[PDB]
């Protein structure tokens, strides 16, 4: 969903 839950993965 958002930069936040998306932390350091892709």
């Amino acid at each position: 969903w958002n930069p936040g839950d998306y932390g350091g993965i892709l």
Partner: single-chain antibody
Amino acid sequence: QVQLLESGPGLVRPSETLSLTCTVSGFSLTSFSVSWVRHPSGKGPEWMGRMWYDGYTAYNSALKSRLSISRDTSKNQVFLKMNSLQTDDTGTYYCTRDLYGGYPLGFWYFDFWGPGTMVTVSSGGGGSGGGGSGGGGSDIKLTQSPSLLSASVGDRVTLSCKGSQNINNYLAWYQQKLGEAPKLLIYNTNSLQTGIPSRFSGSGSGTDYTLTISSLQPEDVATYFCYQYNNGYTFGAGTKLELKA
């Protein structure tokens, strides 16, 4: 000791607002970011949101404008303010600490789940009941095959997680035992947590992902949830044992 105490009243009335308060005896709030997860009475695990390391509240597409996270970093308190309360929200509400503290690169995800605060958001109802013969319900969407199974001590059994939208490689397998919070078993499809030997093998790419339970001991009788982190952020269906008599 690091103790995550998520606070809740037992019974609350629909329409108003519930402030779920995680008082953390151990860490300062900007270091190991708190993730919030509801498990309702006969339904399954929904991820609600995460307030991250600097200060960003990321949320679920269904539970979006209901949820307001404030946080007091001097008193050690994360406040999830849930506005406009609905009759089906009876559940055990969890707050979960991160494995990485501040640094993002190659994200390891989650370690300390708090005890689960049981809050009935329902003025006369809850989920399932009666009088002796009365209690039973469990219906969730994300296809894990087989979820209902019949394996004994020694028997090898493979759980195939097919995702509703495509995942690439980004899946954490969470083992919930009877009376327990969901434990992190294998992160990023195939990378094991520091502690567990090479025995539960999570293997796959794109949409279909295979957890082989190889040497089945009494601790292996558990509910194995797929946390997909690519499109949405959802925990899927898991695993249960059907009792014939």
